[PDB]
Amino acid sequence: MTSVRKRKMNRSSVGKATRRNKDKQRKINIQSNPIIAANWDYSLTMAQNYKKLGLRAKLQTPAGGKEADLSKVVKRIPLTKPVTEVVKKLEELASRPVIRKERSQSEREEEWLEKLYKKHGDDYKKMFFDKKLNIYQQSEGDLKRRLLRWKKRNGI
Amino acid sequence: VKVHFDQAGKKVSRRNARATRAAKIAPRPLDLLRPVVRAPTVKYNRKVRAGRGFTLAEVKAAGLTAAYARTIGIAVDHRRQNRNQEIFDANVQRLKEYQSKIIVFP
Amino acid sequence: SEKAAFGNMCRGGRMFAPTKTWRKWNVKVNHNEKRYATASAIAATAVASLVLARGHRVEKIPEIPLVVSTDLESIQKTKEAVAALKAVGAHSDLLKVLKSKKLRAGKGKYRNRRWTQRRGPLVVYAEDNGIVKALRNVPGVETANVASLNLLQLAPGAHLGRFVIWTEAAFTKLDQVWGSETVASSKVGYTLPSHIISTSDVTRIINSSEIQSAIRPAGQATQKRTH
Amino acid sequence: AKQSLDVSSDRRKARKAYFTAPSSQRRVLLSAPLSKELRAQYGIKALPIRRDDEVLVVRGSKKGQEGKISSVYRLKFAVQVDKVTKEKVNGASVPINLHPSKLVITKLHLDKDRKALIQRKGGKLE
RNA sequence: GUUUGACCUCAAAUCAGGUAGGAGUACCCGCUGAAAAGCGGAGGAAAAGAAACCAACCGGGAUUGCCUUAGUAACGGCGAGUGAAGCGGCAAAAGCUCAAAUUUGAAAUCUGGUACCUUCGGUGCCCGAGUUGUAAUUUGGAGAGGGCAACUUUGGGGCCGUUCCUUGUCUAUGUUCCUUGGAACAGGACGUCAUAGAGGGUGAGAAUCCCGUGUGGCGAGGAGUGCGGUUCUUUGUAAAGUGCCUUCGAAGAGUCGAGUUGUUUUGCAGCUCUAAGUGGGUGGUAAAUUCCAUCUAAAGCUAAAUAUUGGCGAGAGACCGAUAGCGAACAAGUACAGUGAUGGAAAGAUGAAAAGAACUUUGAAAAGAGAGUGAAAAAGUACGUGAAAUUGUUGAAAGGGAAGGGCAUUUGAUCAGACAUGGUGUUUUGUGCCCUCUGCUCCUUGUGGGUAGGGGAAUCUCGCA
RNA sequence: GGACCAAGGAGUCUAACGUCUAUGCGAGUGUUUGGGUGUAAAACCCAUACGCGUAGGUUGGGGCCUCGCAAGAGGUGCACAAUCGACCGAUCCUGAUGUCUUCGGAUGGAUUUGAGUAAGAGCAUAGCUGUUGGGACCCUGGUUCCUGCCGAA
RNA sequence: CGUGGAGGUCAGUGACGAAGCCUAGACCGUAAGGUCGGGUCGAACGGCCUCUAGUGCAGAUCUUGGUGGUAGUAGCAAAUUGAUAGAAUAAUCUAGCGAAACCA
RNA sequence: AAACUUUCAACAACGGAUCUCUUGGUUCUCGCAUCGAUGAAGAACGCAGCGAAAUGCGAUACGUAAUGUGAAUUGCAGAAUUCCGUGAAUCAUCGAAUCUUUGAACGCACAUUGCGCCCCUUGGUAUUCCAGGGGGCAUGCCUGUUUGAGCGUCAUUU
């Protein structure tokens, strides 16, 4: 506060461009999945909240000590003295099949296949050595694949 | 002369990073799937360690491609070489266990 | 400031010994030794002649160490928890703390340390259920999980025996936290440390029977002046 | 106590905020509590005072006096109420600069901005 | 053909569109360099960074930074002392792009202009650029051509939310009685709130007077693809991936290196010389006409972990409290000084409110005196408080060219000097926790504690009077 | 060396070894690079590494026991010291059984050796202090409270 | 013994007067010093157990500030539309202004 | 004896020490990344009803417009608010303008208030002449458009 700039900006009639950030940098929204956004708690931690989920937070070998957090009573050894839920929800969601579309055929090339289907029929060695309407000289079996896709699409 | 007065502070900031990054990576872990790799240097040759990445051939032995495996969060090193049997097999079992526990969204 | 005549004796000159940052601020402590200090503080909190010896208004409380049910943890409103401590009988300690608010005599009054007052009860919980918000507004009360048990909160001003209130589950959990001869420790390689003397009373040992058998007869306990 | 980090509790910062406050913030600072009757009227405790309304004095040496505010002297964090004056030895008159924390508003001067403000503060405005 | 035209080069444009400079410079990167200064260049970081690496192991695996290695190795009139690195643990993690063989069944590429459109752009048309090579595909971890078998996959918008930023607004409880005070925010009694008893203001220490504080709520305007729903379309023999088979299967040269010189402590630079392709680099290894290891130099980009006495903001302090703390709490880099480069002070507090002394009078004028305000001018814009050195007057004493203290005592002056006023025994009368009778109640349940009603001192007895 | 007076004004901090003392643990010890946690620069918990250390006799003799009323006598003997030993390493000779013609050390000597074996003591923190270096008490001169005890050359 | 600050405590003191100042006022301490009276004064401050230090001054021709004597002296631009005036003829006195050196 | 000197006390001076505050430093931590030829920083000159510094502004000059709030400002003077509002305010916010002369400083010059050139507009008798107003005109570099030039090269009888 002893630079000439800071003193002038202090004495100026502008006022400081003041923005407060330090409160809101601790809290974060998770932004990504609404399911985790539901089960997120903003209180436990990244670590405790992932543990309460059931998802493995860090992959492997944390430095330091985890909270063993006193789940059980451990008794001394005598030395022989003398006498899941949200996991299930995401598992359903990933298990949920998406509404997929079959990759269809284009009208010109299925018409081309339709020309081949009437010109040669079904046999492939004749249509492979056909010049007219096989000018791209398609592969022996690519012909089969496209014709079987066309037949399953149309014409049995 | 420098004193780490910010040692308490930076850790907080670092966990803020470990918070904030985690916010973007919300289901996924922060870290990738790293190999378990035995160390060099006879002082340390009994020690096993976290390695950088597995190999191409090992990920193929796991039954997937490394280009796809980077999307699954499996760290892959091409320039490493697999030369020990038990290292290879244990890391394959590690890959299989990682495959068992993931669920991938389409 | 670094560079900011030239004499320590001079007006406006540089001072003798410019105070530098790299003077030691934090002090390294052996971990067993720190745990030992906390253990002695916890053991001292039971006694309550020590708690009166520090200064607390605990003369009308049910017993020592004072243990309340775990339901105390489930209180989430200030007035209910204060009424609960009335029902305990630590009301006089709270009134002591509330009357004790004085202004700081130093210059540090205008260094954001303006007010000072005594310390009161310490509530120990196993688990928060809104209790720490409820007791936050009442002065002098400070809460602590059994896992932490802050020494500064335990023996403030290095005086042993602050007045400590326990919840029921926390009091059971203290066995988990420090272990015993039966329960292990829950701390890695820690043992509740031993005594060098078993009996705490020396005058009991001196006046027992058998030392009193083995010992020669005593003098007048003040010397008879001769000549 | 102070829970947000963005709130500060420095005495020096707080006084530098107080004495260098712009006037629009000052009329928020220059606030007076309503009467028990006006709280029974509108359901609201304190309000930013202006000059048109009527007030009573509840502290100070001129305690138990009342009047309409002559002018709000916002630059001195103060408020001149009419007819509460010191009469000098020339015979002239100068009002006591009162402070709205020591005042209790008796009769409000209601305006559309004022009625909407009472509405937004939860008032049961007639 | 003495003509005409392609180019190519070079000019010119008050042609169109862009861009460079300077300031600052804490951190960063280069260059220069003494007994640091300087120069140049950037950014929010920069640099470095995906091995021509480290190792010798059961090998590791971009860079960066921390701890350890370690004050070790090594160096050094092996003197002064100088002074690493591998590994390990951690933080952070991320990888990619060119240059080499043809798309030749069609330069498939892009700037610009213009016309429109849903404009960080799109479409169309037209000039150009470009084969002395712009696109697609391929960077060794290969890859490409095909073929086979299958599978597996599709892209682009919108909108509304969400997320982020910038804001706006709402969200408790005494001003209850008494004393003191100029002023209650002080003291006492009785309260209420509290996820709010941080802080500040209000005429003195204010949870409850005000602002806030705390908890939540409602908005507003943007940023945005981060994802979440809806909605509109998207195929064209389009693009890609995996296994097997077949045929191929091209990479950084004035560089590597060598000598010398300077410089550094081995690199770098200059000068001269200057390569290879089962190549080259680097290191161990030997039972030796050795074997083995490990990378691919001479092209490029890359977040994060990192530095930051600067900027923009915050939040704090076992810091200083006006000779301190910044030179500077104040109209401080000021007044001032210097020709200049530059140097560089002193200086905070009336009061709660100016209520800042109406009016009379002396007085050139300055200053007074009456008077008054104020709680206080023992606060009068010379102003909180107001020490010492030093000054003036009065009083006392001493001295006469006398200096100071120590002891001890007079004399003179002077001060202090009970809120002391009771105890023991006896006696009179009266009263009650005394006596008697009748209770109630708390537990620590006894060698207890509290408490009521009526009667009596006629007799006794205790305490009190 | 001095006109007076007021205020300011001179052994501070840090690093490396060293003694002493206190404290915790103990052949181990050391949380705080870092991670987890939190009421948030506090406290609390700690994985893997790392650091430093670890890896016979005689004479007495504190005591203790017995006896002795006591005085004393006898016995067992802490620490430590002296002796005589032993062994390891070295020392210089012996040079075998074997021996690749120069390999070998077997055995026996000899003195000393050594923070040697012959049954650990260290690590960490704090305090006070010693030496050295950072401006290092301040600028030859100066160098800030009292009392007690010890007190030279 | 004393000083600034810090933790605890005395439900310490305080506008019916804290702190500070003065005190030919008393008291306790061997002393360092401490306690009270009175006066002034106006808003904070102490005792105890601990922590911490920018912690104790007569000197350093120490630093800064204030005030002396020198001294009403030197002397009169020594700092102050234009210039010390007055008188001595327009060639010593009064008046006004007024130092410094130095100072167990 | 007075006067003078010394000492002490009283009151009054002088002085600013002490005490108490403090919109000031000082240090630490956290976040952010943002100056220019679309003219920076810096300088100069002015702007307020009555201003010296401080701040703010640029001849639209302690400001204009916009948005929000909702009655002020205040040393004096003076407007007001039709007040249930298109509304004071030295208010806040600020995204649209203005922005004097310089300054990387940019028409050429410069010890000049020297000398221009081009374009647009208006008027003064206006076809000539003059006046006014407005806007451009620095260097380097890149890409493109346009105009040339070269004894550079080549072609040139279907």
Swiss-Prot record, chain A:
Originating gene: NOP16
Indicate where this protein is primarily found: nucleus
Compositionally biased region (Basic residues): 1-10, 17-27
The subunit structure is: Component of the pre-66S ribosomal particle. Interacts with NOP7, RRP1 and RRP15.
Is rRNA processing included in the keywords of this UniProt record? yes
Report the locations given in the UniProt record.
Nucleus, Nucleolus
Q: What's this protein's function? A: Involved in the biogenesis of the 60S ribosomal subunit.
Task: Give Gene Ontology CC terms.
Answer: nucleolus; nucleus; preribosome, large subunit precursor
Region Disordered: start-end pairs: 1-30
Family membership, please give it. Belongs to the NOP16 family.
The record's PANTHER family line, in alphabetical order, gives: HSPC111 PROTEIN-RELATED, NUCLEOLAR PROTEIN 16
Output the GO biological process annotations, alphabetical, semicolon-separated.
Answer: ribosomal large subunit biogenesis; rRNA processing
Task: Please give the InterPro entries that the UniProt record associates with this protein.
Answer: Ribosome_biogenesis_Nop16 (IPR019002)
Q: What are the Phosphoserine sites (modified residues) in this protein?
A: S104, S106
- Designated name of the protein: Nucleolar protein 16
Pfam families per record: Nop16
Q: Which keywords does UniProt give here?
A: Nucleus, Phosphoprotein, Ribonucleoprotein, Ribosome biogenesis, rRNA processing
What is the additional note? Present with 2860 molecules/cell in log phase SD medium.
Q: Does the keyword Ribonucleoprotein apply?
A: yes
Swiss-Prot record, chain B:
Q: Which GO terms describe its molecular function?
A: RNA binding; structural constituent of ribosome
The entry's localization annotation reads: Cytoplasm
Main location class: cytoplasm
Gene Ontology CC terms, in alphabetical order: cytosol; cytosolic large ribosomal subunit
Q: Is Hydrolase set as a keyword in this record?
A: no
Q: Which GO terms describe its biological process?
A: cytoplasmic translation
Keyword list (alphabetical) reads:
Cytoplasm, Phosphoprotein, Ribonucleoprotein, Ribosomal protein
Q: Does the keyword Oxidoreductase apply?
A: no
Q: Fill in the subunit field for this protein.
A: Component of the large ribosomal subunit (LSU). Mature yeast ribosomes consist of a small (40S) and a large (60S) subunit. The 40S small subunit contains 1 molecule of ribosomal RNA (18S rRNA) and 33 different proteins (encoded by 57 genes). The large 60S subunit contains 3 rRNA molecules (25S, 5.8S and 5S rRNA) and 46 different proteins (encoded by 81 genes).
Q: What else is known?
A: Present with 133000 molecules/cell in log phase SD medium.
Q: What does this protein do?
A: Component of the ribosome, a large ribonucleoprotein complex responsible for the synthesis of proteins in the cell. The small ribosomal subunit (SSU) binds messenger RNAs (mRNAs) and translates the encoded message by selecting cognate aminoacyl-transfer RNA (tRNA) molecules. The large subunit (LSU) contains the ribosomal catalytic site termed the peptidyl transferase center (PTC), which catalyzes the formation of peptide bonds, thereby polymerizing the amino acids delivered by tRNAs into a polypeptide chain.
Sequence similarity: Belongs to the eukaryotic ribosomal protein eL13 family.
Protein name according to UniProt = Large ribosomal subunit protein eL13A
Which portion of the complete protein is shown here? 22 to 127 of 199
UniProtKB/Swiss-Prot annotation, chain C:
Its name, as the record gives it, is Large ribosomal subunit protein uL4A
User: What is this protein for, i.e. what is its function?
Assistant: Component of the ribosome, a large ribonucleoprotein complex responsible for the synthesis of proteins in the cell. The small ribosomal subunit (SSU) binds messenger RNAs (mRNAs) and translates the encoded message by selecting cognate aminoacyl-transfer RNA (tRNA) molecules. The large subunit (LSU) contains the ribosomal catalytic site termed the peptidyl transferase center (PTC), which catalyzes the formation of peptide bonds, thereby polymerizing the amino acids delivered by tRNAs into a polypeptide chain.
**Omega-N-methylarginine: residues carrying this PTM:** R11
Q: Which gene encodes it?
A: RPL4A
Q: What is the effect of changing I205A?
A: Leads to an inefficient release from ACL4 with a delayed assembly into the 60S subunit
PTM per Swiss-Prot/TrEMBL = N-terminally acetylated by acetyltransferase NatA.
Q: Which UniProt keywords apply?
A: Acetylation, Cytoplasm, Methylation, Nucleus, Ribonucleoprotein, Ribosomal protein, RNA-binding
Q: Where in the cell is it found?
A: Cytoplasm; Nucleus
GO terms of biological process kind: cytoplasmic translation
**Keyword Ion transport in annotation:** no
| Family note | Belongs to the universal ribosomal protein uL4 family.
Question: Any notes on this protein's domains?
Answer: The eukaryote-specific C-terminal extension harbors a nuclear import signal and delivers the ACL4-uL4/RPL4 complex to the pre-ribosome, triggering uL4 release from ACL4 and incorporation into the 60S ribosomal subunit.
Instruction: Give any Gene Ontology cellular component.
Output: cytosol
Residues spanning the membrane: none
UniProtKB/Swiss-Prot annotation, chain D:
Q: Which GO terms describe its cellular component?
A: cytosol; cytosolic large ribosomal subunit
Q: Write one Pfam family the protein is assigned to.
A: Ribosomal_L26
Query: Where does the UniProt annotation locate this protein?
Result: Cytoplasm
Alphabetized UniProt keyword annotations: Cytoplasm, Ribonucleoprotein, Ribosomal protein
Q: Does the keyword Ribonucleoprotein apply?
A: yes
Q: Which domain of life is it from?
A: Eukaryota
Q: Name one GO molecular function term.
A: structural constituent of ribosome
| Gene3D superfamilies the UniProt entry points to | 2.30.30.30
Q: Does the keyword Ribosomal protein apply?
A: yes
Q: What's a GO biological-process term for it?
A: cytoplasmic translation
Q: Which InterPro entries match?
A: KOW (IPR005824), Rib_uL2_dom2 (IPR014722), Ribosomal_uL24_CS (IPR005825), Ribosomal_uL24_euk/arc (IPR005756), Ribosomal_uL24_KOW (IPR041988), Translation_prot_SH3-like_sf (IPR008991)
Q: So what family is this one in?
A: Belongs to the universal ribosomal protein uL24 family.
Q: How does it assemble?
A: Component of the large ribosomal subunit (LSU). Mature yeast ribosomes consist of a small (40S) and a large (60S) subunit. The 40S small subunit contains 1 molecule of ribosomal RNA (18S rRNA) and 33 different proteins (encoded by 57 genes). The large 60S subunit contains 3 rRNA molecules (25S, 5.8S and 5S rRNA) and 46 different proteins (encoded by 81 genes).
* Other remarks in the entry: There are 2 genes for uL24 in yeast.
NCBIfam families attached to this UniProt entry: rplX_A_E (TIGR01080)
**UniProt protein name:** Large ribosomal subunit protein uL24A
**What is the species of this protein?**
Saccharomyces cerevisiae (strain ATCC 204508 / S288c)
